[PDB]
Amino acid sequence: GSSGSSGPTSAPKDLTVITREGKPRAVIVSWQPPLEANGKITAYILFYTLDKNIPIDDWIMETISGDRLTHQIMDLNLDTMYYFRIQARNSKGVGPLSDPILFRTLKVSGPSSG
């Protein structure tokens, strides 16, 4: 009957990644709801990976509650560039992703440069 499953055609914004204060390997990726969401978001799928040479598919996809606009990652490498790409998904489907943000992870084991 209702075969009108299209989905959002725009990626989220305000995509920021900050290292937790209680844990370095942990980060709080916050974002905002898209405009062309084409319908309230029911779920948010985030993707992150240190290597971009691989297809967004090979990346590590993470499901999030549409109600929430943030995601906490655990077990992250130290002193390694990590790309970020999140998107919006509604009862219908999911659209594109946001630009790959370049955010390096804290460094617990440092050679004592500074």
UniProtKB/Swiss-Prot annotation:
Source domain of life: Eukaryota
Cell compartments where the protein resides: Membrane
Tissues and organs where the protein is expressed, per its UniProt entry: Found in axons of the central and peripheral nervous system and in differentiated cell types of the intestine. Not expressed in colorectal tumor cells that lost their capacity to differentiate into mucus producing cells.
PTM description: Ubiquitinated; mediated by SIAH1 or SIAH2 and leading to its subsequent proteasomal degradation.
Domain Fibronectin type-III: 11-108
Reported impact of residue 103 to S: In a colorectal cancer sample; somatic mutation
Family note: Belongs to the immunoglobulin superfamily. DCC family.
Function: Receptor for netrin required for axon guidance. Mediates axon attraction of neuronal growth cones in the developing nervous system upon ligand binding. Its association with UNC5 proteins may trigger signaling for axon repulsion. It also acts as a dependence receptor required for apoptosis induction when not associated with netrin ligand. Implicated as a tumor suppressor gene.
Subunit-structure text: Interacts with the cytoplasmic part of UNC5A, UNC5B, UNC5C and probably UNC5D. Interacts with DSCAM. Interacts with PTK2/FAK1 and MAPK1. Interacts with NTN1. Interacts with MYO10. Interacts with CBLN4; this interaction can be competed by NTN1. Interacts with SIAH1 and SIAH2.
Involvement in disorder: Mirror movements 1: A disorder characterized by contralateral involuntary movements that mirror voluntary ones. While mirror movements are occasionally found in young children, persistence beyond the age of 10 is abnormal. Mirror movements occur more commonly in the upper extremities. Some MRMV1 patients have agenesis of the corpus callosum. Gaze palsy, familial horizontal, with progressive scoliosis, 2, with impaired intellectual development: An autosomal recessive neurologic disorder characterized by global developmental delay, delayed walking, intellectual disability, horizontal gaze palsy, and childhood-onset progressive scoliosis.
Further remarks about this protein from its record: Inactivation of DCC due to allelic deletion and/or point mutations is related to lymphatic and hematogenous metastatic tumor dissemination.
Name of the molecule in the record: Netrin receptor DCC
Species this chain originates from: Homo sapiens (Human)
Name of the encoding gene: DCC
